[PDB]
């Protein structure tokens, strides 16, 4: 095993190259970048440009998808189901991708924008909305389980 | 350099380890997590709970610290993330080089941060550039060697 410092530089350099080759967009958010790749492969959707802030992937049938992803360490850690801030509701559905400790897909779900809003909380500190990816959201009857589909593409 | 598939496995394995060691939390902010670890270790401070958004680390003497970090590879790289709360005692600025060794680090009182920030209307917050002029004096403390020590 190597030092923490080297590991960061190992990860940042690999991501930097993957980013120049056009497979990913940013190098700044590994879990989100991975989930984008995975949702792009599972749908053959097109990536947004970096400038498109309301959504990340557009399916060929039209759907605009905001991809939110996070690494989970313990399915029972309720505070770890917290997703990064949403600052625009101008999309058709979100895709929530929860990774385990291996950065393999633990659960993934397609949530209509309406159900996301219903679950969100506004925050003035961040100028956005906070959503917790609780089981009750993940198993909501208008949510699609995308777990095995994203495991079929890598991770 | 290598094949795309190997880079994915190279990045995924490195992240796997960083995450096992507790160095990474959500996976979206590697550099930020590390800078926090370094400032938490260079002090004996406590990490903020989920609800406390105004600061990141509380020192044993009380001080609440908002940590802002960037990898330095050019004024556009000195740009820090948006501040939307002034409810903290000082900011700790951590500039890494590409190897993630600490290149410059500085403890800036809230007053000097405010003095150096400018409000931005489209983002509804304040932006601070970690220029040398801030890093040197203005009554800010050099924390560079201190953060390199806990490395
Ligand atoms: Ca996203
Ligand atoms: Ca921070």
Numbering used by the authors:
A (entry chain A): 15 to 169
B (entry chain B): 15 to 87, 91 to 168
From the reporting publication:
Both proteins are homodimeric, with each domain involved in target sequence recognition and catalysis.
Crystals grown in the absence of DNA contained either an NhoI dimer, or two Eco15I_Ntd dimers in the asymmetric unit. In the NhoI crystal structure without DNA, the dimer adopts a more open conformation overall, primarily due to a different main chain conformation immediately downstream of the dimerization helix α0. However, the hairpin of β-stands β7 and β8 is much better ordered, likely because of crystal contacts to adjacent molecules. Together, the data suggest that NhoI and Eco15I_Ntd can latch onto DNA thanks to an opening of the DNA binding cleft, and due to flexibility of the β-hairpin that closes the DNA binding cleft at the top.
